[PDB]
Short mmCIF file of C-alpha atoms in Angstrom, two decimals:
data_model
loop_
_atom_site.label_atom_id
_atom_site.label_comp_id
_atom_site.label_asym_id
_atom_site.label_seq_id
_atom_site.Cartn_x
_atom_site.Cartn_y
_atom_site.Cartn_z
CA UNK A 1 144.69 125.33 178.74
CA UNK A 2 144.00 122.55 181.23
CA UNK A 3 145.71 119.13 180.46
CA UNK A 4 149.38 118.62 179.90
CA UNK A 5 150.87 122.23 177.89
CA UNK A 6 147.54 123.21 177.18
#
């Protein structure tokens, strides 16, 4: 969503 694939 907002760190690495997220």
């Amino acid at each position: 969503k907002k760190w690495w694939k997220f």
